[model samples]
Target: RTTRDDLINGNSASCADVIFIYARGSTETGNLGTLGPSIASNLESAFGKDGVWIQGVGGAYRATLGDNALPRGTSSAAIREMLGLFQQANTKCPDATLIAGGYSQGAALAAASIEDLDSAIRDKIAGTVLFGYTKNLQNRGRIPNYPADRTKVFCNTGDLVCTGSLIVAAPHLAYGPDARGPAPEFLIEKVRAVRGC
Candidate 1:
């Protein structure tokens, strides 16, 4: 299928049960990063390979510099693109579940998009998962339509990024293993919740 078709209909052959919009952390390689890959790998394990995993990429600059310096930082346009993709998918596949997530700067972008999405499209989303989120940006962001219980934010203790602190970066990058272990189960629970199970 064409790229546009895949983006809109979510792999026609697979007709995915869920379409996941994942944004990568600052400087993290798309589809190869710590959080993005872990999240996708775990979801594939639970839901099979057909899951629509779209890795949003716009913040490829160094974590402490470059993209982080942009107005609203980088990933703003990427977040808007993600929203457009979600809108197309929701319009074409009304029953498919939607999940949005990210790590660090990625999480900030996801948060912004979720808040701005049209309510009807927002309602289609099953849940969200955020890891190593930037505390200041997240506070300014919002997850408007997702139920509180359905969302999971995984930030390791002492992670400066998520705590609004100005400490080392190791802790901020330490959530890979922590997130991978529980993300699939968390997503499964979200799916059931959306199903009213």
Candidate 2:
């Protein structure tokens, strides 16, 4: 149960060869959605659990309601809050593999955070996996920039969120099931990019 305070303060004795910062979607559920845990499980399966630590970020964003639930500034705050944890861990373990993953509103947060991250920290990021990234926001430059090669966007055809349809309900909830295998493999590719393995 990693809270916003824990993330903001970077309070954790946990360290790993690879640190996965996963942000959850709207509705403020404790879970970081299926894509986050799915990729996490695969990483743990391939490497010992000790080799990887998944940090789930919490925030208030209503996927189904609230006019300002998914506001960019608010979501960015959560992103920065979570990034502080990664920054601390990176300072402690400079050579650790750094990765970021998110879904829906979480994806938007991750994408924006990457752009705001210090270049030193940004360079350390091995890869980022985003599910249902809001394309509409990106057009407005609110999403900022990220390494295209290092970032993977998984948006199903029917997901209005990705297309910027702007609706309460959508196929937005349909990424975790399909992304399990690819997300890990994507990270592995990034790992190879960093370590030359």
The numbered model that scores best in TM-score is: 2
What is the TM-score of candidate 1?
0.78
TM-score per model over all chains: 0.78, 0.79
- lDDT tens string, model 2, 1-197? 32322233443465467767777666645546555666777877765766766667653333332422455523445666666766776676676778887776677767767777788888778888777776444444233555667877787778777666656355777775656788888887797677621
Clashing residue pairs in candidate 2, if any?
none
Model 1 Cα shift for residue 102 (angstroms)? 0.3
Q: Report the number of backbone clashes for model 1.
A: 0
- lDDT (Cα, 0-100) at 137 in candidate 2: 46
lDDT on C-alpha atoms for all candidate structures: 0.63, 0.64
* lDDT digits (tens) for residues 1-197 of candidate 1: 00113344355545667777666666665333566666666776777766554434433223333444444444556666667767776766667787777777766666777778888888777878888766444463345555677678887777776666535477786786766777766876787676521
Quickly count the clashes in candidate 2: 0
Whole-structure CA lDDT of model 2: 0.64
